[PDB]
Amino acid sequence: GSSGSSGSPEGQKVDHCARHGEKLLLFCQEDGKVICWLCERSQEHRGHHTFPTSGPSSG
Ligand SMILES: [Zn+2]
Numbered sequence: 677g678s679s680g681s682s683g684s685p686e687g688q689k690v691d692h693c694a695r696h697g698e699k700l701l702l703f704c705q706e707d708g709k710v711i712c713w714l715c716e717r718s719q720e721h722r723g724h725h726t727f728p729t730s731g732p733s734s735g
């Protein structure tokens with residue numbers, strides 16, 4: 677698999693998934709919420725099309 681990109685507790689906690697702990701930068705359409713990497717690749721949001729929120733930004 678993959679160890680991860682950010683693995684430090686001193687990291688800017690921004691919309692961190694309370695389930696996995698990964699930063700939520702994606703936006704699921706089917707659900708209309710913000711999910712993380714693991715989530716997206718999870719049977720929960722599997723196949724679901726998500727978009728990069730990039731914080732306070734429309735496009
Ligand atoms: Zn998650």
Ligand SMILES: [Zn+2]
Nearest residue numbers: 704707721724
């Ligand atoms: Zn979804």
